[PDB]
Amino acid sequence: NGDNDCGDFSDEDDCESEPRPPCRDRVVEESELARTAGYGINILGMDPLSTPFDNEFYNGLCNRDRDGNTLTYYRRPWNVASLIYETKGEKNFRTEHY
Amino acid sequence: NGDNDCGDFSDEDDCESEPRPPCRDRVVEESELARTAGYGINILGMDPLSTPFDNEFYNGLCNRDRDGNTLTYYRRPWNVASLIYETKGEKNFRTEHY
Amino acid sequence: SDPLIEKQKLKKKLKEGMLSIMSYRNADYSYSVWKGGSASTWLTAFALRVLGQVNKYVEQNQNSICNSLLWLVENYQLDNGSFKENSQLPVEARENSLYLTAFTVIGIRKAFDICPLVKIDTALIKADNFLLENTLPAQSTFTLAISAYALSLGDKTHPQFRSIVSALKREALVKGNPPIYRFWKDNLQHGTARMVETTAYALLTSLNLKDINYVNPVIKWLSEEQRYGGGFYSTQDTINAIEGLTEYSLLVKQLRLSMDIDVSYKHKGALHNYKMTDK
Amino acid sequence: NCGQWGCWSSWSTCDATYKRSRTRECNCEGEKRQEEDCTFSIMENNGQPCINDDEEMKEGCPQPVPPENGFIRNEKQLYLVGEDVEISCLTGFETVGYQYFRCLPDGTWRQGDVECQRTECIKPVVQEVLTITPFQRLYRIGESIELTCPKGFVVAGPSRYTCQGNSWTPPISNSLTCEK
Amino acid sequence: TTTFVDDIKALPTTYEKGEYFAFLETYGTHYSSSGSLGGLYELIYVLDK
């Protein structure tokens, strides 16, 4: 049913039934975004690591992610519970004299 | 299955079955990037050495690397566990007078 | 090396080949190429030829061949006498049908001497009738030659069979006067040598007729020529050429003139005795 | 002294199939693989032959005119003087008398007394609808055969006819053509 | 993922600190329950007289 879990054509090895698409709407795949949500930061080490788990698998009906800067629809994997596109931003200044 | 391990056509010597591609999406090979991740630095010597091992081999389904400056997809070999594209940068200054 | 060691090694290789051809047998007793996904009659008749060749030397189970032939007779035999295969220019369809029919006739005739059956004889009669009825027009040299060989494996003195043989001899190509080389070309006014198959089939047909003078030029042709070679499948033509050379050597051995003639009277003593030799 | 293709690889071992490959490396435009055929089907080795450009189909006692049913064995173009060739009767017939043709010194033949008497009649090739009873290869004189049009509509005319060696004469174009 | 599943399947059960220390450096000490994509910058300088 167009659900890539194991490999490119591993799960799609043999299909006797028709290739029924899971979703008809055009939803662009998550390109370079938080799709790689796994991070293995070392408290004694340095910056976070890569993903220790698979983050491409999805379970059932597509969950729409109708948000972002431009007009485009991304996918949210079944492993990622939530993702927001809030463009928060802050900065501080300070100075003193002795 | 398009998995280069030994040579250019050494592993691909004879193919009775169809040349099934391992991945359908267009993923550009890792050009001049950390692909050469092996380094043999000498603690008593000088700057790191070349790779002491093979870093082109890959095991199974392609692992996407959808990140970077521009919109391009690189490959991560099965030997390299993780690779990040963080463009960190810092600098310091100091001065004194006696 | 000693001939006994080579013969034992060849027997071991024949046993390995028998195990291999047994590995290609499906549960439905048919013969397939790739894992038994689809059934093919061409490879089935090829394996039947191989098993008929094996029959003469060591052994072959008759029950596994009788039901295998009955399967084809029941399924792949058309009521008209034609034969087809399941695994996959209007006259090209009829040409391919006649080709498959001749191939199946050759296979069933090779496998018939070990399993004589009334139903197999009926199938052979129907297929021979089909081939004799539908080979009237000149369609192709290769098809004509394979049909002539399939009919020569059976009845060799049929009127329509002799007409087909005469047509094939008229369609023959010669070089020199007297002809030193004799061969057959499929394409008219035309890995590139495709006529070797029809030349081998016509050689086998002529060897079935026991004509040394007509076979000798084809032997000269297949000995050395522009093949280089130069054949298909392989070994659809390689084994045919080997069998042709084998039949040529056998028929040369047949003409030894070692007959010992002793003519005598029925109720009285012998009159004379002839000792015939080559000299 | 002022990308380019590299050197080709060694020819791989000839596989069980024709497919044999050779690979070139761009280390540019061209091909990276070349797949050719190999079987070594020519086992015999006699000598290098010389070939012509193109040929044609067609350029002692001559070939005689055989009696009825023909069937001359060991057919050749020219027979030597004094050589005798035996003639046989075509199925279904049988040789009666003296069946031999001896080459005379001149171009004529002896033409000995010989004839062909029918011993068995053959199965008719009229139409594929039969399935004729009885269904055999040959029938001896005195046996009757019956043909029908299965399974419904049938053809009128002689249904049962026997072969007495009298040169069966059934129609050949409109033999039965059983209509509804 | 298949690699992590294979690593957990081929894993001892008698407190092998040696292999566990390697696995720890290989796949980190603890993963992220929630992250924050983006980037930060900061500059500091100090003066003393």
Three-state secondary structure along A34-86? Answer: CCCCCCCCCCCCCCCCCCCCCCCCCCCCCCEEECCCCCCEEECCCCCCCCCCC
* Chain D CB contacts of B7 below 8 Å: none
Q: Is C138 in contact with C191 (CB distance < 8 Å)?
A: no
Q: How many helices (H) and strands (E) does chain B have?
A: 0, 2
**Alpha carbon distances (Å) from D54 to C64, C173, C175, C176:** 50, 11, 9, 12
Closest by CA to C72, choosing from C93, C99, C48, is: C48
Query: Which residues in D have their CB inside 8 Å of a CB on B?
Result: 9, 12, 15, 17, 19, 21, 23, 25, 33
Q: Is D14 in contact with D23 (CB distance < 8 Å)?
A: no
CB pairs under 8 A between B and D: 12
Judge if the upstream peptide bond of residue C229 is cis by omega within 30 degrees of 0: yes
Tally of CB atoms within 10 A around D150? 10
Name the helix (H) or strand (E) containing C250: helix C238-254
Residues B86, A47: C-beta atoms closer than 8 Å? yes
Angle at C232 between CA C230 and CA C234, to 5 degrees: 105
**Alpha carbon distances (Å) from A32 to A35, A40, A80:** 7, 18, 15
| Nearest-angstrom CA–CA distance, C58 and C50 | 13
| Nearest-angstrom CA–CA distance, C224 and D49 | 6
| Nearest-angstrom CA–CA distance, B25 and D32 | 22
* Chain E CB contacts of B59 below 8 Å: 3
CA D98 to centroid of chain Cα atoms:
30
Residues A7, B22: C-beta atoms closer than 8 Å? yes
Q: Is D138 in contact with D120 (CB distance < 8 Å)?
A: yes
* Chain B CB contacts of A2 below 8 Å: none
Query: Which residues in A have their CB inside 8 Å of a CB on B?
Result: 6-10, 30-33, 35-36, 40, 47-50, 56
Q: Is D115 helix (H, G, I), strand (E, B) or coil?
A: strand
**Alpha carbon distances (Å) from D70 to B5, B47, C209:** 73, 100, 15
Name the helix (H) or strand (E) containing C16: helix C3-23
| Nearest-angstrom CA–CA distance, C210 and A10 | 61
Query: Which residues in A have their CB inside 8 Å of a CB on E?
Result: 6, 33-34, 37-45, 48-49, 51-54
Closest by CA to D116, choosing from D91, D138, D139, is: D91
Asked if the domains at D57-114 and D115-177 fall in one CATH topology, the answer is yes
SS3 sequence of A81-97? CCCCCCCCCCCCCCCCC
Query: DSSP letters of C80-138?
Result: TS-B--S---THHHHHHHHHHHHHHHHHHHHTTTTS--HHHHHHHHHHHHHHHHHTSS-
Max CA-CA distance within chain C? 73
Query: End-to-end alpha-carbon separation of chain B, Å?
Result: 70
Q: Is B70 in contact with B24 (CB distance < 8 Å)?
A: no
The total number of residues shown for chain A amounts to 98
Query: End-to-end alpha-carbon separation of chain C, Å?
Result: 35
Query: DSSP letters of D52-80?
Result: -S--BS---EE-----TT--BSS--SEEP
Structure tokens at D134: 């009885």
**Amino acid letter, residue D98:** Y
**Amino acid letter, residue B16:** E
For testing the chain B interface, which of D14, D17, D19, D23 should be mutated: the one with the most B CBs within 10 Å?
Answer: D23
* Chain B CB contacts of D23 below 8 Å: 8-9
CA D86 to centroid of chain Cα atoms:
22
Place of tokens 């790739």: C34
Hey, which chains touch D, using 3+ CB pairs under 8 Å?
B, C
* A87 to chain E: closest CA residue: E38
| Nearest-angstrom CA–CA distance, D62 and D110 | 13
Nearest to D15 among B8, B9, B14 (CB): B14
- Using DSSP bridges, classify how beta strands D144-146 and C181-183 pair: parallel, antiparallel or unpaired: unpaired
* A31 to chain B: closest CA residue: B66
Alpha-carbon dihedral D68, D71, D76, D79, rounded to 10 degrees: -50
Q: Is C54 in contact with C18 (CB distance < 8 Å)?
A: yes
| Nearest-angstrom CA–CA distance, B83 and A49 | 8
Residues A38, E29: C-beta atoms closer than 8 Å? no
Judge if the upstream peptide bond of residue D175 is cis by omega within 30 degrees of 0: no
Q: Which residues contact D123 (CB under 8 A, 6 or more apart)?
A: C125, C129, D132, D135, D136, D137, D138, D139
Specify the DSSP class assigned to residue D173: S
Please give, rounded to a whole number of angstroms, the shortest distance from the CA of B3 to a CA of chain E.
Answer: 17
**Amino acid letter, residue C262:** D
Domain C1-254's class?
mainly alpha
Domain D115-177's class?
mainly beta
Q: Which residues contact D17 (CB under 8 A, 6 or more apart)?
A: B16
Nearest to E31 among A33, A34, A38 (CB): A38
Q: Is C47 helix (H, G, I), strand (E, B) or coil?
A: helix
For testing the chain B interface, which of A32, A39, A49 should be mutated: the one with the most B CBs within 10 Å?
Answer: A32
Closest by CA to C81, choosing from C102, C107, C53, C111, is: C102
Hey, which chains touch B, using 3+ CB pairs under 8 Å?
A, D, E
| Nearest-angstrom CA–CA distance, A18 and D143 | 62
Q: Is D145 helix (H, G, I), strand (E, B) or coil?
A: strand
Q: Is D122 in contact with D93 (CB distance < 8 Å)?
A: no
Q: Provide the CATH topology of domain D57-114.
A: Complement Module; domain 1 (2.10.70)
Structure tokens at C218: 């084809």
**Alpha carbon distances (Å) from C211 to A9, C203, C215, D72:** 61, 10, 6, 12
Judge if the upstream peptide bond of residue C233 is cis by omega within 30 degrees of 0: yes
**Amino acid letter, residue D120:** E
Q: How many helices (H) and strands (E) does chain C have?
A: 10, 4
| Nearest-angstrom CA–CA distance, C219 and C213 | 10
| Nearest-angstrom CA–CA distance, C44 and C52 | 12
Q: Which residues contact D34 (CB under 8 A, 6 or more apart)?
A: D21, D22, D23, D24
Is A42 buried (19+), middle (13-18) or exposed (0-12) by CB count in 10 A?
Answer: middle
Q: What residues form DSSP beta bridges with B73?
A: B66
Q: Which residues contact E20 (CB under 8 A, 6 or more apart)?
A: E12
Residues D135, C122: C-beta atoms closer than 8 Å? yes
Resolution, Å (one decimal): 5.6
Specify the DSSP class assigned to residue E13: S
* Chain E CB contacts of A11 below 8 Å: none
Task: Count CA atoms within 13 Å of residue D61 on its CB side.
Answer: 22
| Nearest-angstrom CA–CA distance, D71 and C156 | 11
